[PDB]
């Protein structure tokens, strides 16, 4: 089976790469392991839900590539509900609020919370988006976990508990599991603490009407039989004139170049001839993905709105199975629902239960947090545990344990002879997201066009015009936010 | 191709498992990815060296399973040279010594060093060998790195520097890369700090005459054509009555049971039907192996012995490419040589050089440490960087980063339907070593014999008689070693007295 380029993986990144090469007139083939496209996106349809995203779902301002590609494919977005108040549930009680962060009243606690977010952003400003290993303190920050950084920075338990929730929600991993350098890079490359965590004007702003799975599905529609489902790649041989790619179902493909568009560690499922260079050989064993169950509970009405709650809950404490929720009701106001994530160690702990047992735990939690018996009467339930997936390895994305990013980070996007590397993990802006999958797929495709003499080197990386539909507003701070002292700062001054 | 049991992997563990099963009367096949058996053991033979171990090589007292297996195969051991003095090189200078650790004269520094080793072993005694996640403080210890633990325990930089060399040499990883719970388990399950690090009476005491690769080679000889070389396994299907195992070169094997005798993360190279359970699916992405280049420099004579140095060097400092060496001269006294390890980040950093460039840096280092110009006159050089191996992933063994051993540790040797797990990583005594490979291969084989109804349950785990050729001396302490205070203990005493 001969072609110009074989793309390994039919997620957003693989599809985005294959579309760009196809549009330029090359013959492309996509080899997809699953019986479906979309990868870490997956939209389920049935009569009870109409459609529901069980994988990645949210898009927001500054994510211009995914918004442009989806629009071209005929998709529209709608705004996640944030009309009414958010809730922070702390020590068994609900506190309603508005804004990026829940209010803090104790003056010492206030200084400590303010300093924490401000310091994460100050640190990020020294970390290059395209080369975090070049931060002036790269080794110092990479050799400690986020747990150790929080222990140093947070003088109050209140700030440490909220910081921990923040880490667990952003990267589906425990603070002690991940490098401080890598985590600080991850926040900075999504535009900072406010942008990453916000609904209005942030990464949770919007969802696609009909589901995000439609991105990969609609590219597969364009490409037709160029997409081969149930073709897990098992072997890549670069010792001859053309590259040879073999699948598990005993097919052989021959191409001038390959794009690897799978999570980095899933490169281990492929046997290489000749062997990979030593730094990549070891890198792909050092880069796990996080752990999460995404759970959606359906109700007759969006009853929380009647109490002036929008459906967003930030829920602290070990006993709560879900630490974060958003309203998942359709833009038409029907199929009322709450989406929640079971994060990191809780995904491992609660996976032992039945689906019915998890539904009961969630409904009882939401009844307490929303202060409503209506939460105890679900009409339907859907969930997906991404820890189970052989061809994802987890969700949302790959995290770096201490020491790995500085030692192996340079390897991620370095070509290996005629194999180029896409996948959201290789992006420089919203890596981890659907936005990063588009950036990395289109960049890896343009590296091949450049290697073919079709475009100049300065066209490999390309800027994206801002979406007219989803424009970004500036992120601002107040004089007091910028200048109030930290807790040890107020002590040095006393 | 039909059989009772397919063993995936022909290193020591898979070879020990296959031998046990074969001896019990079962039909076994070994599917080995490489064109050779032995895996993380590899004995090179050529005219310049005669033979030389480029992978695992040392055995010692308390490693009774590997000693028994090797003896039965007709192999002999000899003692690594420790006749003359050891050297500790720190801050640019060499200090000769004898004993498990260089002597410390400053009384405050002495308290801190004594307390450090003592405390590592005290903590280890809280950790069950067969279940480290059951330690009372397992979560607390697993949620910090070894670097954080050294920062807390060591009240002198001298102790922290030495402990850092200790961690790097024991597990070919950095202190900040590894879980404190996992590292404390690893040391305890090798018999403790003295036993793991010693030559005489420890893990470095002996080598096999002719090389350790003979263990795997001689078992292949016993098994004949049951060992299939250049058969990398790509696919295991358990949806039917018999297990189906497919190889890369397009062959199919059918068996009642399978033993996976490969490093845990190399399980990712196999596509599973049905998919693995979620805990194992994630576990095999969380367990990297360490990084090392093993380097042997050959000389006309063992010239260091004439200066009353045995060849053992503990070398501190970033600029030193090699942090630990042993005399590698043949027991006959010829093919004089120094073996050195390039460890952890230095294996990555120095892999960029040529073989000739690395030889030059090693000779220049040895010349300074030994105060000997003769070190600049090598006659031959061999090396192996284990980081480059597709079918090993690194050496010596698998390490666990913070948080992993408590969350996923119980999965490591849990059977998946009809797949059982061997490999040194699943051992409970000298896991990471050739000893642990034998323990795990024989244990997994006996799990299958029990599943077939051939042996009762209490025979799955079996004790090993002590070697009569290499018996173990106990590790002892003195009254003062046991009861002298730590540095903060002493400060507490001072505070109390002066109150
Ligand atoms: C799973 C999951 C993902 C995301 C979210 C939630 C879940 C449960 N959430 C999103 C955000 C992540 C933040 O960090 C988010 C969370 C919370 C609030 C706001 C936002 C989300 O809502 N928005 C968003 O943009 N991204 C989210 N999540 C991550 C994205 O889903 C993810 O970034 C992209 O989908 C990744 O795309 P790709 O890089 O294209 O990678 P895959 O989807 O994994 O595709 C790889 C395909 O390759 C196939 N494969 C594997 N191995 C193969 C072999 N050997 N041979 C052939 N094919 C192979 C595999 O099957 C895939 O199809
Ligand atoms: C590499 C290396 C290993 C060891 C040492 C040094 C090096 C450079 N040193 C040893 C000590 C380790 C201490 O922690 C030590 C160090 C310093 C001072 C004293 C002692 C040593 O000297 N003694 C010792 O006992 N062990 C050492 N090292 C570790 C051992 O080499 C290792 O423990 C065993 O060899 C492991 O045996 P196995 O569990 O059987 O595992 P492998 O050897 O890796 O065999 C697996 C085989 O599987 C094949 N494979 C892989 N993937 C396959 C697929 N998909 N299909 C089929 N076959 C597959 C692979 O090719 C292997 O042959
Ligand atoms: C004359 C009185 C002097 C008292 C000295 C006050 C020091 C008290 C220690 C409290 C530790 C608080 N945390 C946040 C855990 C560590 C801070 C990290 S760091 O100290 O900035 O490194
Ligand atoms: C007479 C008492 C006065 C003491 C007051 C001085 C403060 C001492 C701080 C030194 C830190 C030493 N290290 C080893 C880095 C950390 C130890 C961790 S732990 O404190 O033992 O938990
Ligand atoms: C810690 C953990 C979760 C969090 O969610 C927010 C938030 N959501 C929408 C506006 N701010 C802020 C926040 C902080
Ligand atoms: C830290 C690093 C390496 C080391 O080697 C020893 C040792 N070797 C032989 C007897 N003791 C002790 C020791 C401590």
GROMACS .gro file of C-alpha atoms in nm, chain A residues 142-143 145 147-148 176-177 232-235 246 248 250 265-272 275-276 278-279 281-282 284-291 345 347-348 351 385 387-391 393-395 399 401-404 407-408, chain B residues 142-143 145 147-148 151 176-177 232-235 246 248 250 265-272 275-276 278-279 281-282 284-291 345 347-348 351 385 387-391 393-394 399 401-404 407-408:
model
  112
  142UNK     CA    1   1.258   2.045   3.781
  143UNK     CA    2   1.420   1.864   4.076
  145UNK     CA    3   0.766   1.822   4.302
  147UNK     CA    4   0.405   1.925   4.662
  148UNK     CA    5   0.746   2.055   4.779
  176UNK     CA    6   0.377   1.490   4.470
  177UNK     CA    7   0.370   1.310   4.129
  232UNK     CA    8  -0.282  -0.059   1.533
  233UNK     CA    9   0.075   0.014   1.415
  234UNK     CA   10   0.319  -0.249   1.549
  235UNK     CA   11   0.641  -0.193   1.347
  246UNK     CA   12   0.318  -0.259   0.956
  248UNK     CA   13  -0.141  -0.572   1.382
  250UNK     CA   14  -0.102  -0.784   0.892
  265UNK     CA   15   0.462   0.685   2.585
  266UNK     CA   16   0.236   0.492   2.337
  267UNK     CA   17   0.541   0.493   2.104
  268UNK     CA   18   0.644   0.193   2.317
  269UNK     CA   19   0.376  -0.020   2.142
  270UNK     CA   20   0.578   0.007   1.817
  271UNK     CA   21   0.895  -0.205   1.752
  272UNK     CA   22   1.155   0.008   1.569
  275UNK     CA   23   1.632   0.101   1.727
  276UNK     CA   24   1.535   0.452   1.837
  278UNK     CA   25   1.898   0.624   2.316
  279UNK     CA   26   1.743   0.950   2.451
  281UNK     CA   27   1.425   0.503   2.380
  282UNK     CA   28   1.431   0.605   2.750
  284UNK     CA   29   0.899   0.717   2.610
  285UNK     CA   30   0.921   0.512   2.937
  286UNK     CA   31   0.928   0.823   3.160
  287UNK     CA   32   0.610   1.008   3.060
  288UNK     CA   33   0.280   0.875   3.200
  289UNK     CA   34  -0.069   1.023   3.147
  290UNK     CA   35  -0.302   1.133   3.430
  291UNK     CA   36  -0.606   0.955   3.576
  345UNK     CA   37  -0.596   0.898   4.310
  347UNK     CA   38  -1.015   0.772   3.988
  348UNK     CA   39  -0.801   0.472   4.096
  351UNK     CA   40  -1.296   0.249   3.988
  385UNK     CA   41  -1.287   0.606   3.301
  387UNK     CA   42  -0.747   0.495   3.289
  388UNK     CA   43  -0.886   0.185   3.112
  389UNK     CA   44  -0.785   0.282   2.756
  390UNK     CA   45  -0.503   0.080   2.597
  391UNK     CA   46  -0.468   0.335   2.315
  393UNK     CA   47  -0.295   0.551   2.853
  394UNK     CA   48  -0.510   0.803   3.053
  395UNK     CA   49  -0.640   1.167   3.041
  399UNK     CA   50   0.268   1.471   3.291
  401UNK     CA   51   0.771   1.351   3.711
  402UNK     CA   52   1.062   1.527   3.880
  403UNK     CA   53   1.389   1.541   3.677
  404UNK     CA   54   1.245   1.433   3.340
  407UNK     CA   55   1.685   1.561   3.091
  408UNK     CA   56   1.453   1.448   2.810
  636UNK     CA   57   0.612   0.744   4.902
  637UNK     CA   58   0.504   1.106   4.854
  639UNK     CA   59   1.175   1.182   4.685
  641UNK     CA   60   1.638   1.405   4.781
  642UNK     CA   61   1.375   1.543   5.022
  645UNK     CA   62   1.755   1.712   5.309
  670UNK     CA   63   1.518   1.365   4.311
  671UNK     CA   64   1.391   1.101   4.056
  726UNK     CA   65   0.982  -1.040   1.972
  727UNK     CA   66   0.628  -1.091   2.107
  728UNK     CA   67   0.377  -0.835   1.972
  729UNK     CA   68   0.031  -0.965   2.073
  740UNK     CA   69   0.209  -1.378   1.824
  742UNK     CA   70   0.693  -0.994   1.504
  744UNK     CA   71   0.491  -1.371   1.185
  759UNK     CA   72   0.735  -0.128   3.123
  760UNK     CA   73   0.838  -0.347   2.820
  761UNK     CA   74   0.487  -0.496   2.856
  762UNK     CA   75   0.385  -0.185   2.654
  763UNK     CA   76   0.544  -0.343   2.342
  764UNK     CA   77   0.264  -0.607   2.347
  765UNK     CA   78  -0.092  -0.535   2.226
  766UNK     CA   79  -0.342  -0.717   2.456
  769UNK     CA   80  -0.724  -0.491   2.707
  770UNK     CA   81  -0.531  -0.515   3.036
  772UNK     CA   82  -0.692  -0.041   3.419
  773UNK     CA   83  -0.441  -0.062   3.707
  775UNK     CA   84  -0.259  -0.060   3.188
  776UNK     CA   85  -0.142   0.259   3.371
  778UNK     CA   86   0.337  -0.011   3.286
  779UNK     CA   87   0.370   0.360   3.180
  780UNK     CA   88   0.490   0.469   3.530
  781UNK     CA   89   0.799   0.246   3.588
  782UNK     CA   90   1.118   0.353   3.401
  783UNK     CA   91   1.457   0.181   3.429
  784UNK     CA   92   1.775   0.364   3.530
  785UNK     CA   93   2.066   0.487   3.318
  839UNK     CA   94   2.252   1.189   3.443
  841UNK     CA   95   2.522   0.838   3.129
  842UNK     CA   96   2.293   1.077   2.932
  845UNK     CA   97   2.674   0.944   2.566
  879UNK     CA   98   2.556   0.199   2.733
  881UNK     CA   99   2.018   0.326   2.780
  882UNK     CA  100   2.024   0.238   2.408
  883UNK     CA  101   1.863  -0.107   2.442
  884UNK     CA  102   1.509  -0.136   2.295
  885UNK     CA  103   1.458  -0.472   2.472
  887UNK     CA  104   1.494   0.001   2.852
  888UNK     CA  105   1.798   0.071   3.078
  893UNK     CA  106   1.277   0.251   3.968
  895UNK     CA  107   0.904   0.783   4.105
  896UNK     CA  108   0.714   0.948   4.396
  897UNK     CA  109   0.355   0.821   4.450
  898UNK     CA  110   0.365   0.517   4.224
  901UNK     CA  111  -0.091   0.338   4.411
  902UNK     CA  112   0.016   0.064   4.165
   0.00000   0.00000   0.00000
